[PDB]
Every structure is written in structure tokens, then in C-alpha cells.
Paper text:
The enzyme phospho­triesterase (PTE) is capable of hydrolyzing such OP compounds. The present study focuses on Bd_PTE, a dimeric metallohydrolase that has a (β/α)8 TIM-barrel fold with two Zn2+ ions embedded in the active site. Carbon dioxide reacts with the side chain of Lys169 to form a carbamate functional group within the active site, which serves as a bridging ligand to the α-Zn2+ and β-Zn2+ ions, both of which are required for full catalytic activity. The buried α-Zn2+ ion is ligated to the protein via direct interactions with His55, His57 and Asp301, and the exposed β-Zn2+ ion interacts with His201 and His230.
Electron density corresponding to O-ethyl methylphosphonate, the less expected hydrolysis product of O-ethyl-O-(N,N-diisopropylaminoethyl) methylphosphonate, was observed in the active site of the C23 structure, implying rapid hydrolysis of this ligand in aqueous solutions. Thus, based on visualization of the projections of different product ligands, in C23_2, C23_4 and C23_5 the following residues accommodate the P–O–ethyl and P–O–isopropyl moieties following detachment of the leaving group: His57, Gly60, Ile106, Trp131, Asp301, Leu303, Phe306 and Ser308.
Author numbering:
A (entry chain A), B (entry chain A): 35 to 361
The structure:
Amino acid sequence: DRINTVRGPITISEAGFTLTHEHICGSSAGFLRAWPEFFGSRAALVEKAVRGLRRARAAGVRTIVDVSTFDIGRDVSLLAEVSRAADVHIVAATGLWEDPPLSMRLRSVEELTQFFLREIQYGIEDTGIRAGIIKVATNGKATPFQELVLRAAARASLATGVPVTTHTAASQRDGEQQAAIFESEGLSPSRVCIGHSDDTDDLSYLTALAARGYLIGLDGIPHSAIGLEDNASASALLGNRSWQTRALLIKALIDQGYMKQILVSNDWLFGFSSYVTNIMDVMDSVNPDGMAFIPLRVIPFLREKGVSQETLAGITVTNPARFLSPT
Amino acid sequence: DRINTVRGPITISEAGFTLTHEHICGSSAGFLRAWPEFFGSRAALVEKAVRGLRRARAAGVRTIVDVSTFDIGRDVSLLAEVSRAADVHIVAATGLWEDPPLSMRLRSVEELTQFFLREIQYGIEDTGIRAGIIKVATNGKATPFQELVLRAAARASLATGVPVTTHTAASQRDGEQQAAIFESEGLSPSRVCIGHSDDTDDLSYLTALAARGYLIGLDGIPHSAIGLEDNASASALLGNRSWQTRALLIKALIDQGYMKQILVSNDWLFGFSSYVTNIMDVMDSVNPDGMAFIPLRVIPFLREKGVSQETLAGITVTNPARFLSPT
Ligand SMILES: *[C@H]1CC[C@](C)(CC)CC1
Ligand SMILES: *[C@H]1CC[C@](C)(CC)CC1
Ligand SMILES: [Zn+2]
Ligand SMILES: [Zn+2]
Ligand SMILES: [Zn+2]
Ligand SMILES: [Zn+2]
């Protein structure tokens, strides 16, 4: 009956309009602490995040799910500060992404389960802030360690009811192996969002996942390097498909009967140290609306394409609440 | 005229008997903060380190150089606590080892130089504690990023006078490429210790480095899996050469005229999360003396083999002071 946020438990009705895959800062463990000048300063990063979340709140957003893990450099004290100043709920994540250090990569499935359970059930570091989601990742066929991470995420979710959300290389159909591993541990697909699924146009892949009961994360809608001229690093990161092409996948899944299984987000950030220098400036030039892009641009676009206000409210309010509520 | 420690500047004469390659904890960035239970508890790790350093101090040690970097999970607040409780000076390190995260691996040589200079000239995180050595690493041919790290370490040392110490795969003669890169930046070999050099018996490699002026780090003397039965992970980490075989390299370099260029250490730790679970228990069974192994076992061994007290005092007191004193 309660979702954990960086400011404590909230009721399901308090979540409201929820972006289910976002980041305050995409970094690495300990990096903001050791090298804040990379972001100008910690205070500058806080100010940029607060301004952005305030603009998102003005556009209707009430909650974001920050799916930054330990190895994305999640700083829940930073999240708590930004959430208080902007009056936007923030759900924090446990799990591991694609850059775990040796001290994680050498661990067993049982050890990883203990760590994920620590952050869900006890707290993150010494903050008492508890994670409300488990984030995992593959980029193609799972490494042996990533198989353990997926299994540990399933075990932590089975013990707590907290959902799992994934990073995929969608064009490699990673979600199929992720699903197989999750189901081998007994995890219900209704507890799992297969993310970055808007990175592919393969409807046979997307509907294969949705038919089994998975939630489908169409979470990078504004990610596009169309127009960026001669920027190889931005094109490799953002792709050459338009935001409209990504957004139309929302309509496609609605038209196939999966409106209750769609989760939509921007996968935006306010600082970004785990990629090339100045990528944040490039991304901000692509999408000045930042996290407000979903309510300000995507929802009107889909309404114009014939999607009802009621269905879009179900996707942005009802589905995230059903997903995040521990079950 | 001063060496920076985790408790502030000390005079050269205060350093005394110095172990030049040690670790309080071999971990990963943020790991002790996020998962202290891996070590039992933070307090248990502190207590184990204080007991060990007190036993080292009783055996004659006055200073250790903790060559844990950012990506070894260096916690200078932990080092400061242990150094105060044990009355042993601890010199902290900057640099990067073999497990840098994406936020480091994507950086330029200029950016890395800024980061190393930050930790030497300003402070580590928000602690005001300044590093007194720069640690770098290769395992075979340098990766492109490791080339940048070596160059940035050279630049930081050229600006500050602080020395550089390296991790090598000694049997692959890494020190030769490390030397080439350092010298291409104008760094004096007298500011560089090529470490893990006791991992090889190749005198042609060791003397090639010493002839150019490098300091030679014979820093893992008690590392041996001889006697360990059927432990593949311990054998891969520690090797099958005896501690006596490693220690006799000290005598070999003395006999070749390099007594002033030898640095000796244990490469010991009190916690170790970046390898297999329970490796610390295995290592402690191999060498119950821990960091006291050099004064309690190696120095008497070399005296029995004909090395003078005066030469061993030069190696353990004079050489570390000459190396660490900024120049
Ligand atoms: C909201 C109304 C229901 C549809 C039209 C699907 C029938 C989607 C938009
Ligand atoms: C101390 C005295 C000098 C030697 C014998 C090298 C001549 C080493 C031991
Ligand atoms: Zn991702
Ligand atoms: Zn993301
Ligand atoms: Zn090493
Ligand atoms: Zn070491």
C-alpha cells in the first residue's frame, strides 16, 4: 500500500503522473564525491536538477523513478535534496547496471541477493533511504555475472514485491533472455519492465514480451541524433530514429491491446559523466524540455494521432502505480 | 621538506621505517559505504586494521604507504581513523588502478591530470587530505586508457614532485612500456617505482629498469600459495614462488649495486573485496604476521644471508624517505 521514495513512504495515489526511467545524474560510484568539479560543482548540478524537475512538475509530473544503481553513481542524498527542493517524488533503485566494479563482479547470486535486499529492506548506505525498484542490465547475450545479477534481482523481488526494470540492447532482443532467466527463478512477468524497448522497431519482439505479461519500457523517446551533424559519439548513443518514430510505438502497443503494459519515460539526466565530455550539453540542445518532454510533446503528439486522453492517463498514472506498488 | 599523510604533513625524519606498498582495504569505489557487512562491519574492519598496524609498529614500522586509488575504494577517512588509533603514519594515493569505472575511462589525459592534481594539491573528496603518491597500473600491454593514465601521472608528478608507483604484470615486462611512456612525458625515473617486481625472476628485466634509474618495488614478499592445497584462486593470485625466493631478489639487487633503488613491502591488506570471498582468511593463514612480515621475517632472513644491518636500514628508512620527499 506504500511506495518507498527518497523522502519516505508515499501512498499509491500520491505518485500521480510518474516517469518510470530517469536519472538525476548518470555517473559512477564515488565519482561525484571525488570529482564534483567535473559537473562544474555539486551545487551547480543540484540547481540544474531542481530547475529541470520544477519545469517537469509544472508540466504535470509528480514522481520520477531514478533508475541509477550503485554503479551509475546513485547518490540518494543528492536525490533527496533535489526531491525536497522541487516537490517531485523520487523513487530510488538498487541493482546493478553495465559497469559493476570487481567487488561486485566477483560475488555470488546469494551475495548479490543480500546486497539488493539490503538496499530495499534496510537502507542505502547509512541514509535509511530504501529502494523502490531493482535495475539490471545486459548489452547482448548476458555475461556470466549478468546472469547472476538477473537471478538475484528476481530473488530480491520475490522476497519484497518490489519490481524489476531492465536495460537492454533492444535490437539484439535481450529481453528474451532476460525473461527466460527471470522466469527460471519464478518471477512473475507483471513485476518486470523490459526497458529501452523503444530502441527497436521489431514488433515481433515487443509483442512476444508483452504477450507473456511483461511491461514494456518505451523510455528514451527524446533520444535522437537526427539533425546533429557529424557527431559520431552522439549518433552512437542516441541513434538516428526520430522521437516521433519512438513515440509511435506507444500507439502501436495500444492498438495491439497492451495499453496496461506500457511505461513511458525520457531517460533524461542532469549530469552525465559516464560518456564523452559535454554530452549533456549536446543532449540538452536536442531536447531543451528535458524530463518535461513526455508531457509537453509526446502526449499532445499521441492525442493528435488519435490516442484518447483517458488511455494516456492510464499509461502515465495507472500503470506506474500498479508497477511500483509492492506485490 | 614535508610528506603529506592522512593526518597532515610530516617531516622526512618522522617517516622512519616505511612500507611503501600496502593497503588498509582492497575494495572498489563506494563499496565499503554501500555494503559494510561484506567485511562483517566497518567497525570490525577498523579494529582488524588497528590491531595489525599496532603489531607492525611494535616490529619497527613507523609509516605505511597505502597505494589504494579511487578504484581500489580508498577511504581516506578510514585511513585517518586507523592511523590515529595505531600511531602509524599513512600516506594516501591518487591515480588509477586496473578497475576504473566509465566516468574515469572516458576521460582525456588533461582531465585525468586535473583529477590527480586535485587529490595531491587540494584534497581527496571533501576531507582536505592530500595524496603523497600517484598509483598507476598495467597488466600486459597498456590499454589506450592506461596510456593516458600513465601520462597524466607523469604530468601530475612533474607539477608537484610527488612520486609515481606502479602495478605491473612483471612476467610480461610491463615496466619497460611504463618507463617508455613516463620518459616520453619527461618524468625522471628517480620519481618512479616499478612495482610487483618481485613477481618475476628475470634479472635482465629488473636491471634494465634499475640501470635507467627506476626504483624497484619488491613489494609482495609474503605472497605465496606454496602449501595451499587445491586452491586455484589463491594460486592464481599469490603464485607458487616462495617468500624466500622473492626476498632473495632484494639481495640480488644489492649485489648488483642497486641498494639505493630497492623498495620493500608486503602488499598486505586488512579487507579484500575485489577478489574471491574469504581470500583475506586464506591470506591471513599464509602470513599471520601481516604487515609485520617484512621486519619480523624478511630482515632477519637477509641478515642471515649476509646482508648488513646498515644496508637494510638504508633500504627501509633512507630509500622511502628519498622517494616520498617531493622533488
Ligand atoms: C483512448 C481510448 C481508447 C483507445 C481509442 C483504444 C481503443 C486509445 C485511446
Ligand atoms: C650491508 C653492507 C654492505 C653490503 C655487504 C654490500 C657490500 C650489503 C650489506
Ligand atoms: Zn540503460
Ligand atoms: Zn537510464
Ligand atoms: Zn597491484
Ligand atoms: Zn597493492
